[PDB]
Each structure stands twice: as C-alpha cells, then as structure tokens.
Ligand binder design. Structure first.
Ligand SMILES: [Ca+2]
Ligand SMILES: [Ca+2]
Ligand SMILES: [Ca+2]
Ligand code: NA
Length: 483
C-alpha cells in the first residue's frame, strides 16, 4: 500500500501554567499536527496528583481523571475528565493515536499516617540495613474521600508498599524499609545504590499479589474507558523488571488492542538498556537516552566533536526497532532533574538526524515546538516543520550512510515505488560547511534536487550514475529532495 512514517510528539513540558487548558489545546491543535505527519501523541499523566499543580508524577489517585473533588480541586493541572475524553476524540478523528503516561513506581499525597515497624537502610546501598527495627509514623493510608468506591473500592495501606523516606513522628528523612512477612526491596531493578527500587514517596511493592491485581484491573478499566492506544511507562528502572511483561500481556489480551508501549529507563549505559530489553522479551520500546547525551555533548563541543561517532553505542544503532529517539524532554529542560539541554544551534541538526533516518521511532518535544517562555526559549516550529514534511513525504526506502568525516556527515533514502516523488539526501555539520558526493539511486538520474529546509538556494542535479554532489552551510543542515 501507500506507506506513511510514524512520528510521535510529547505533548507537554514541565513549566506549563496550572490553568487546566492542555486537554482543550490538544482538541484545538489535532488537525494541524495531523496534517504535518504526526501520528501519535504522548500525553502527560491524566490522573490526580498530590495537588492540582502537580505535573503528574506525584500520583495520588489513578481513578481520578480530574473528576472528583480531591487534593484541593476537581480538575488536574491539565483539565477535567470530560475535557480529556474530548481531546482523545479529536485526536482519533484526526487519525492520530494517543499514548497515556503510566506512573506505577510510587504513590504520594496519602490521606493519613499509620504506625509501621521499619528499618533504616544505607542510601548508597539499600541492601545494607543500618539500624535496628523501630516504629515510625508513615504516610501510607489512601482512602480517596472525594471518590469513595466509584470504579474501585480498593484502599491502600502500609503493607502494599516496601518503604518510605520520612518518619512523621520524629520528622526524619531516612530510607525506611518496612518489616513484615515477605517484605523486601523488589528484584530485579537497577543496581545503582545496591538496589534502586526506592525512589520517592511511598514505594509500591510489586511482589504483593493484591497490588498486581489492582494495577491490572486499573489498566483494563483505563483502556475501556478512554480508548487510548498505548502507554509511556515512567521510571521503569525502579520497578521490578518482570512486572511489565506480565501487566502488558494482560491488558493487551483483555482489551484486544495492540497497545504500543515505550518505557523510560534513564541510563547512558547501553548495556543496562540491553539487559532490560532482554529481561522484558522485547515487549516494549525504550527511549534512547544515550543518543540524547550524544546530541548534548556535540552541541557543547564547539565543532570539535567527532561526528563519525554520533551513533556509536546508542539504541538507535543497536536496536533500531525498539528505540524511541528524541532530542530533549521535560526532564532535560533547564533547571530540571536531568537538565542537559541541547544548544539551539545544534537542535535542528539533531532533529534532521532522527526524523530522516530509517532507524528508530522519533519523538518531537512540545517545548521545542512551541517554545519555553519560562527561560525565554523561542519556538522552533519554523525549523521543525520542514523536517516533518521531509519525513512525511520523502524519507522512504533504502538508506546509504556517510558518517565519514569529523564535521560533515550525511545519508540518503532512495524512496519507494509505492510513494512517487520520495527520495532524499541529507547533510549536517557541526563545523564549517562543504559538499559530499552521495548516492541517491540510479532511478533519480537527471532529476534536480532542492533544499527543503530553505537554508540553501542552489540546486543539485543527479548524474547518470545516481550520484549527486550535495552541499551544506557551516553549522547547519540541508535536506535535498527531488523537484
Ligand atoms: Ca517488595
Ligand atoms: Ca520502586
Ligand atoms: Ca566536529
Ligand atoms: Na517496591
């Protein structure tokens, strides 16, 4: 048939104002985004957090999609339940898929405390206990006073969690592990800090049968209510590895939907990512964090970065079909947790790289597209749109790589017969400009190519052999496509 590349978009950024307008914006922008070739949207957590202003990762109630009066308000930072459903309707009507953010690591905003026997563990080695057992007052009682028993009568208590990091009685910060039959940090998880199961708030015990059943019930309920098309999994390295293949297979079989899933395993070590994929049987894709670090490193190297090494040890290279590529996200933003913002000059080159190459499933960042007023970061829509059109109409077929110079690197796509007019030749450089002969295909012999980005006004004519001498300006990008 006539193919169309897949392109995802993270539709949110950290510093959005708490005005309950995001769901409305999704409904309003759906067709515009759709026409550019965006095929799926990753939406932020839609359920009630610790307060109305919570970005969503301080999850309080998974069944409150901005519908009940809990935590100071009815709506979430993004809007109400009815608005969320309308957003999903608009996206589907425009032909796009919707991925929902899933936060299963912890739970915060407890309604009350409970006295629990606990032991302190070494922050740098959670496997080592550093105190005797003693009673603490932990925030583990979840009753959901605003919701009651609507949708689910499940009440959370201390035994559904593995530990917390605050004793309300003595007002102390310690990593507390709960005592009890079968109580222990989950495994397997990331080994940093000995065992990185515990992260923040009340840590979920993935070994507790009732917790597993409850999350499986929520999954089915969520999909059957919203009709979402996939998931974005939060903090997977802090969650028992074997839990997800189990949860996913259940939800997929019960709903009958394929449910594409991408998990966030934050690590620049490609080995840990390989291990995770192996341990989960390729049941989900992962964000290519290592590639983000590459982009970031190159942007700060003032041209000295060796472009020939750009793909080395990245998921895009090792597991192209399970890699979700990106330039920046809500965590890499200035002032954030994993801040490592790619400099503006390099940003368009990075987008050309992930949007026109065949490896990976690219994700465009809301912050980059619409700008981030918080830090006077402008909208790059003018630079990104031409690249979106490139992916939509031209980036198809056999690829030829030219990662053979410390500055200027390129690649071509021959195009496909089922997509007339397709074919492309891209060049990017982190230093001075120049030219490079590249093979686009004998089938394009005699055709004239032009720079879709608009950066260059000259044209390139393909010789009888299918080769062209493409050009690029210094510290820039040029995407050549047939007239
Ligand atoms: Ca446990
Ligand atoms: Ca955990
Ligand atoms: Ca260089
Ligand atoms: Na746990």
């Amino acid at each position: 048939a006539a193919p169309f590349n897949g392109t995802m978009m993270q539709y949110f950024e950290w510093y959005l104002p708490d005005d309950g307008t995001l769901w409305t914006k999704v409904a309003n922008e759906a067709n515009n985004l759709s026409s550019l070739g965006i095929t799926a949207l990753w939406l932020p957590p839609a359920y009630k957090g610790t307060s109305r202003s919570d970005v969503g990762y301080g999850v309080y109630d998974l069944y409150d999609l901005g519908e009940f009066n809990q935590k100071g308000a009815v709506r979430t930072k993004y809007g109400t339940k009815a608005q969320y459903l309308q957003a999903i309707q608009a996206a589907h009507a425009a032909g796009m898929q919707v991925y929902a953010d899933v936060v299963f690591d912890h739970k915060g905003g407890a309604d009350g405390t409970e006295w629990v026997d606990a032991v302190e563990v070494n922050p740098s080695d959670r496997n080592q206990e550093i105190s005797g057992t003693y009673q603490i007052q932990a925030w583990t009682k979840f009753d959901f006073p605003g919701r009651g028993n609507t949708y689910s009568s499940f009440k959370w208590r201390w035994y559904h969690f593995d530990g917390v990091d605050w004793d309300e009685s003595r007002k102390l910060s310690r990593i507390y592990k709960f005592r009890g039959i079968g109580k222990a940090w989950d495994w397997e998880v990331d080994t940093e800090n000995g065992n990185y199961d515990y992260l923040m708030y009340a840590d979920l015990d993935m070994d507790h049968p009732e917790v597993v059943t409850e999350l499986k019930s929520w999954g089915k309920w969520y999909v059957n209510t919203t009709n979402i098309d996939g998931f974005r999994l939060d903090a997977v390295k802090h969650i028992k590895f074997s839990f997800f293949p189990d949860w996913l297979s259940y939800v997929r079989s019960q709903t009958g939907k394929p449910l594409f899933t991408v998990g966030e395993y934050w690590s620049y070590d490609i080995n840990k990512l390989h291990n995770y994929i192996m341990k989960t049987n390729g049941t989900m894709s992962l964000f290519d964090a290592p590639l983000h670090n590459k982009f970031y490193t190159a942007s700060k190297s003032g041209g000295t970065f060796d472009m020939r090494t750009l793909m080395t040890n990245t998921l895009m290279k090792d597991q192209p079909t399970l890699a979700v590529t990106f330039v920046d996200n809500h965590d890499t933003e200035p002032g954030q947790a994993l801040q490592s913002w790619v400099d503006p000059w390099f940003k368009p080159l990075a987008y050309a790289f992930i949007l026109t190459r065949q490896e990976g499933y690219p994700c465009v960042f809301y912050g980059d597209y619409y700008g981030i007023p918080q830090y006077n970061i402008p909208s790059l829509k003018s630079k990104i749109d031409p690249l979106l059109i490139a992916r939509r109409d031209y980036a198809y077929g056999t690829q030829h790589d030219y990662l053979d110079h410390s500055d200027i690197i390129g690649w071509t796509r021959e195009g496909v017969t089922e997509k007339p007019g397709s074919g492309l030749a891209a060049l990017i450089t982190d230093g001075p400009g120049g030219s490079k002969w590249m093979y686009v295909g004998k089938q394009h012999a005699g055709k004239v190519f032009y720079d879709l980005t608009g950066n260059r006004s000259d044209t390139v004519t393909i010789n009888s052999d299918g080769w062209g001498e493409f050009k690029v300006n210094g510290g820039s990008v040029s995407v050549w496509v047939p007239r």
